[PDB]
C-alpha cells in the first residue's frame, strides 16, 4: 500500500503513466491550487518497490502539463507548457493558446519527433538534437479538435472529436488531404483511443456520454454504445480482454465486452478519498493505482477478475466480427 | 557532503530509533542512542564480524564485496551500509 | 537405522518452506547498473 501525500494534500492528480523501459517505474503529474506550499507544476517519478513518497522530482515554479517520455527508452522527457511552448529535459541529468496533447514519433535513426495539439486544435510538430529543446524547428497543421488519436499501424493518420459535434480524420502528408469526418453517432467527442489488439479498431467518446467503436475500415461506427461518464478518461485494458473503463466521482464503471453484453460489467465507488482522479493499470499485476482530487495516491488488487484466458485471446477477432454483425443487426 | 545528505535523509526517515555513523574504525561520528557504551560494543565488535564477513565473501572468490549488511530482528532493524571510509548503521522499527 | 531421525529431519519442513519463500522474496537486490544516455 503506497498512498503518496508528499506535499500532495492540496493538489489534484492530472495524469498517471508507467514506463516501458522500467516496467516497475511510474510517473505522475498533478496540478495544485494552493501556492503556499513547496513549488508549482508537477512531475513526480517513483518505482513500485521504492518508498511511498516520490523518489525523484523536478523542482521549479513552472506549471507543467502535457507530459510524455522518450519512445525507445526513458532518456529524454518532453513537456508541453501552458503557454504553447514546449520543453525537453535530459533524464540522465540532475502564444495565446495552451497545448492540449503531446506525442513522440519514434524515428530510431535520431531524435524523435514531437507533436503538440494546442487548446484551439491546431497541431504543431518538430524535433531538434540540441535539447536546450529549441522550438525554432516547427511545422503547423490545420487541426480543429483537441485530443488527436493516431493510427497504431500507420502513425501518419489521425482522428479527433470536435466541439462542433463531428469526428474529423486526416493525416500527416497533407493537413487537408482527407478532411471528411467520422459520423458514427455524430456527437461532440472529447476522447479517442485504439483497441490495442489485432484490428484497426479505435474508440471515441463524446460529451453526451456516448462511446463509439471507430473501425478504421468503416465510415459508420460499429457499436454505438452508451453510458454516463463517457466524457471522462477511457482506456483499453492491458489484458487480452477488450475491457473498457470510465471513472469520475470516486466511481469506476468497467466493461468486459469479451464475456458479457455492453452493460457495465463492474462498478466501484471508493471511500478512501472523494472524487477519484487519473488511474493506471499495469499488465504485470492487478495492483491498480489511482489518484484522488485531494492529490493523494492509492492502489487496490482484485485478482479474480484478472483474465478469463479462453474467450478473450483468439476469439477477440471473432468478437469484432460479431460487433460488425451487431451493426448488420442495427440495420 | 553526501555523507551529510545521507545522514540527513536517514534522520528524515521516520521509524529510525538509534542512528550510528561510524568510520571504518570503531568511531561513532554521530549516534541517536540513549547510552554510548552500548553503541561502542557494537560499533567495535560488529566491524570485527564485518571483517569476518568480507573474509568469507571473498573466500568464495573475489567476485563480490560486502555491499550491505541489513539485518531485521523482532524488536528492531539494524541497517548496515559498509562504506569505503564509513559504515552507515541505523536502528529502525522493522516496518 | 534410526527412522525417527529421518522423521525429526522431516520436521524441519515448515521452517524450510518458510525460508524458501523468504529467499524467493529476497532473491534480487536493487540493480542500478551504470548507463550513459548521449551525455551531451
Amino acid at each position: 500500500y503506497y498512498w503518496s501525500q508528499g506535499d500532495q494534500r492540496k493538489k489534484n492528480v492530472t495524469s498517471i503513466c508507467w514506463n516501458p523501459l522500467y516496467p516497475d517505474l511510474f510517473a505522475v503529474s498533478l496540478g495544485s491550487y494552493d501556492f503556499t506550499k513547496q513549488r508549482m507544476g508537477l512531475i513526480c517519478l517513483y518505482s513500485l518497490k521504492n518508498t511511498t513518497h516520490p523518489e525523484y522530482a523536478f523542482n521549479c515554479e513552472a506549471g507543467v502539463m502535457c507530459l510524455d517520455f522518450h519512445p525507445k527508452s526513458a532518456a529524454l522527457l518532453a513537456v508541453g507548457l501552458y503557454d504553447g511552448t514546449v520543453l525537453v529535459y535530459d533524464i540522465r541529468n540532475k502564444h495565446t493558446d495552451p497545448v492540449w496533447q503531446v506525442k513522440w514519433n519514434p524515428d530510431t535513426s535520431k531524435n524523435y519527433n514531437f507533436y503538440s495539439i494546442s487548446s484551439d486544435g491546431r497541431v504543431m510538430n518538430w524535433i531538434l538534437m540540441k535539447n536546450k529543446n529549441e522550438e525554432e524547428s516547427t511545422l503547423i497543421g490545420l487541426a480543429c479538435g483537441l485530443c488527436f488519436d493516431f493510427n497504431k499501424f500507420e502513425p501518419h493518420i489521425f482522428l479527433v472529436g470536435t466541439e462542433e459535434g463531428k469526428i474529423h480524420k486526416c493525416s500527416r502528408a497533407y493537413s487537408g488531404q482527407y478532411q471528411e469526418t467520422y459520423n458514427g453517432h455524430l456527437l461532440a467527442v472529447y476522447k479517442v483511443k485504439w483497441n490495442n489488439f489485432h484490428p484497426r479498431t479505435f474508440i471515441s467518446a463524446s460529451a453526451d456520454w456516448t462511446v463509439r467503436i471507430w473501425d478504421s475500415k468503416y465510415t459508420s461506427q460499429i457499436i454505438c454504445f452508451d453510458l454516463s461518464m463517457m466524457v471522462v478518461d477511457a482506456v483499453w485494458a492491458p489484458y487480452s480482454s477488450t475491457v473498457f473503463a470510465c471513472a469520475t466521482m470516486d466511481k469506476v464503471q468497467v466493461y468486459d465486452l469479451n464475456v458479457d453484453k455492453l452493460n457495465k460489467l463492474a462498478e466501484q465507488k471508493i471511500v478512501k478519498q472523494p472524487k477519484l482522479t487519473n488511474l493506471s493499470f499495469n499488465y504485470k499485476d492487478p495492483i491498480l493505482l489511482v489518484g484522488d482530487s485531494h492529490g493523494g495516491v492509492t492502489l487496490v488488487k482484485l485478482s479474480p477478475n484478472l483474465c478469463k484466458s479462453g474467450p478473450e485471446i483468439k476469439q477477440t477477432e471473432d468478437k469484432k466480427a460479431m460487433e460488425e454483425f451487431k451493426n448488420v443487426k442495427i440495420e | 557532503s553526501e555523507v551529510e545528505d545521507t545522514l540527513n535523509r536517514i534522520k528524515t526517515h521516520k521509524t529510525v530509533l538509534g542512528y550510528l555513523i561510524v568510520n571504518s574504525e570503531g568511531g561513532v561520528v554521530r549516534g541517536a542512542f540513549k547510552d554510548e557504551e552500548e553503541s561502542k560494543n557494537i560499533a567495535n565488535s560488529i566491524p570485527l564480524l564485518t571483517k569476518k564477513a568480507r573474509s568469507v565473501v571473498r573466500d568464495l572468490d573475489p567476485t563480490n564485496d560486502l555491499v550491505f549488511l541489513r539485518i531485521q530482528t523482532k524488536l528492531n532493524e539494524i541497517m548496515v551500509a559498509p562504506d569505503d571510509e564509513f559504515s552507515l548503521i541505523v536502528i529502525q522499527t522493522k516496518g | 537405522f534410526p527412522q525417527a531421525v529421518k522423521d525429526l529431519k522431516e520436521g524441519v519442513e515448515k521452517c524450510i518452506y518458510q525460508n524458501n519463500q523468504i529467499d524467493l522474496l529476497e532473491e534480487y537486490f536493487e540493480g542500478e547498473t551504470s548507463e550513459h544516455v548521449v551525455e551531451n
Binding site: 518508498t51 | 545521507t6 559498509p82 562504506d83 569505503d84 571510509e85 552507515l88 | -
Partner: peptide, 23 residues
C-alpha cells in the same frame, strides 16, 4: 576522491537500505 567514492557507495547503500521486507 575518497569522499566521492564513499558517496558513490553510500548512494546505492541508502537505495537498498530503504527496501526492507514487506508483504
Amino acid at each position: 576522491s575518497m569522499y566521492s567514492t564513499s558517496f558513490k557507495r553510500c548512494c546505492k547503500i541508502m537505495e537498498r537500505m530503504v527496501v526492507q521486507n514487506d508483504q
